[PDB]
Amino acid sequence: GKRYRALLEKVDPNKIYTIDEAAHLVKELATAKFDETVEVHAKLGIDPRRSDQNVRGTVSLPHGGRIEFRNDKTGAIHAPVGKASFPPEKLADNIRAFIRALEAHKPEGAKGTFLRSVYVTTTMGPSVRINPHS
Numbered sequence: 646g647k648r649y650r651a652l653l654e655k656v657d658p659n660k661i662y663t664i665d666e667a668a669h670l671v672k673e674l675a676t677a678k679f680d681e682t683v684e685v686h687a688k689l690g691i692d693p694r695r696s697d698q699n700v701r702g703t704v705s706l707p708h709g710g711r712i713e714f715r716n717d718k719t720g721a722i723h724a725p726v727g728k729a730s731f732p733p734e735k736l737a738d739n740i741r742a743f744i745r746a747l748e749a750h751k752p753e754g755a756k757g758t759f760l761r762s763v764y765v766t767t768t769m770g771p772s773v774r775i776n777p778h779s
Contacts, residue, residue: 652771663779664740667765668733674770675729681767682728683736685743687777688721688762691752704746708735712743720761722747729767740765744777 652674662670675681691698693716700722701715708731714724726739744763751759766772 649771656771656773660774662773662775664737664765664775664777665733665779667773667775668737668740670773671736671765671767671770672729672733674773675767676769680728680730681769682725683731683739683765683767684723685726685740686721686723686762686764686766686772687744687747687760688719689716689747690757690759690761691716691720693718693720698752700747700750702746702750704742706742707738709739714743714747726765740775 655670655674671683689700691700699716701713703711703713705711706726708727712724712726714722716722724743726743727736731739744760748759760777762774763777764772764774
């Protein structure tokens with residue numbers, strides 16, 4: 646309803662935020678009822694039909710345990726990078742640690758945009774597109 650749409654006015658439609666900007670913004674787009682989990686959604690440039698071009702692995706996040714991530718057949722992949730309660734600087738570390746883990750799974754030799762689109766959002770909040778190169 647209007648409760649959800651009030652958070653969309655805070656997010657800039659066609660602006661690609663930095664990882665540090667989204668870290669504070671994602672905390673503002675969360676309610677204090679149940680601690681909302683912060684997630685990262687990245688559409689990988691790999692073809693989700695190839696028998697050898699598949700991404701699957703784990704990464705020890707600097708602030709928490711390890712997370713399992715595999716390319717769901719839309720080419721996109723999600724992963725929990727902490728909670729809304731987490732400090733802004735610690736979330737940014739988890740975003741980067743996950744992005745760098747994905748970048749390690751980039752096709753052998755093949756050059757191109759491996760990370761097409763990247764978004765940081767909570768379970769009950771709006772999406773925030775970020776520059777993974779910040």
